[PDB]
Write a protein that binds this ligand. Structure first.
Ligand SMILES: *P(=O)(O)OC[C@H]1O[C@@H](n2cnc3c(N)ncnc32)[C@H](O)[C@@H]1O
Ligand code: NA
Length: 336
């Protein structure tokens, strides 16, 4: 019939909208979202939100109402998802990988393989980096039966645009049940700095700061072309027996190298202070693929707002139900 979602408790243009669009396209169930961002100084749908709506519309021939800047109500009626070669542009206002997060789950169910290319910001603080999708999320999708490969073609450092990320995807042939739990032993720790139009001593101090808290098996510094900057990010990959995780921080004006790296150290220590393989962010990104498989579980040390949001949206669109059981400081998230 018509699923009605609330857009005023938060994320109405963001995580609820993205997950609803994917689930709507996959299941063919229409939805409406109301009061979108009603309490924000610039309320309703902004350009980056509209980009996701428009991208979804393109891949399933949707009928839409309210997809206009400042609209606080959206009605989305999907048609049939179709594969193809798609190009989208979100600009400096949004994140390439969040457009991908919106459309890729629907293309797992398309009538053939697809390629999606998105231009815009790539190294934004509240979005998954293309390297996280490629090196953390995609190996797990593969275990679930889902095959997609993401490549970053050029960077656009928040808050500028200009970046380009592309993903090749094939329709799923068969789903598998992924079960994750403890992280197991460390295999190696890898530290990376990206610099663009930022002096090399910054990267030196950042790697040195990471090396001050962890024994780094790999250290990588990559200087990009000037015009992809200014930008700087620092990342740490933890490859373990049972999973690979990655953490990152984006450099900002008026934050020094030392403090930027310290933030990343604190986050990695928090990860390693719990037994769980899955990290805070990956957790919310496993909810939809596991739900679509119909089974799966993982443990996570602190279930986030995004994790619970995604669970709630999935449960509106699918008969799947999630169980969360806390045991000794970690929460087992499992499909019943
Ligand atoms: P929320 O609006 O905080 O995040 C939206 C989606 O982006 C993913 N994400 C945010 N921050 C990160 C990092 N540091 N690493 C990987 N993924 C990230 C969230 O998990 C949400 O899917
Ligand atoms: Na948002």
């Amino acid at each position: 019939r018509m699923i009605a979602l609330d857009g005023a408790q938060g994320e109405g243009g963001g995580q609820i909208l993205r997950s609803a669009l994917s689930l709507s396209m996959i299941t063919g169930q229409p939805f409406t979202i109301t009061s979108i961002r009603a309490g924000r100084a610039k309320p309703g749908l902004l350009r980056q939100h509209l980009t996701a709506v428009k991208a979804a519309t393109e891949i399933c021939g949707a009928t839409v109402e309210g997809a206009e800047l400042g609209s606080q109500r959206l009605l989305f009626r999907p048609g049939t998802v179709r594969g193809g070669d798609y190009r989208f542009a979100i600009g400096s206002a949004g994140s390439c990988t969040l457009v991908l997060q919106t459309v890729l789950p629907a293309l797992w169910f398309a009538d053939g393989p697809s390629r999606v290319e998105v231009s815009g910001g790539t190294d934004n603080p509240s979005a998954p980096p293309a390297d996280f999708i490629r090196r953390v999320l995609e190996p797990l999708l593969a275990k679930i039966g889902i095959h997609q490969q993401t490549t970053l073609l050029r960077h656009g450092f928040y808050p500028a645009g200009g970046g380009v990320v592309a993903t090749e995807v094939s329709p799923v042939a068969s789903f598998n049940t992924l079960q994750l739990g403890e992280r197991g032993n460390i295999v190696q720790m890898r530290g990376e700095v990206l610099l663009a139009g930022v002096p090399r001593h910054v990267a030196e101090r950042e790697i040195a700061t990471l090396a001050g808290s962890f024994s780094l098996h790999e250290q990588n510094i990559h200087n990009l072309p000037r015009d992809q900057g200014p930008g700087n990010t620092v990342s740490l990959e933890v490859e373990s027996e049972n999973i690979t995780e990655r953490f990152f921080v984006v450099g900002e004006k008026r934050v020094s190298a030392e403090v930027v790296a310290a933030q990343l150290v604190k986050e990695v220590k928090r990860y390693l202070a719990s037994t769980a393989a899955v990290g805070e962010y990956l957790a919310d990104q496993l909810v939809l693929p596991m739900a679509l498989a119909g089974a799966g579980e993982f443990t996570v040390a602190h279930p986030s707002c995004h994790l619970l949001t995604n669970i709630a949206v999935v449960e509106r669109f699918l008969p799947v139900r999630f169980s969360l059981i806390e045991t000794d400081g970690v929460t087992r998230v499992s499909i019943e």
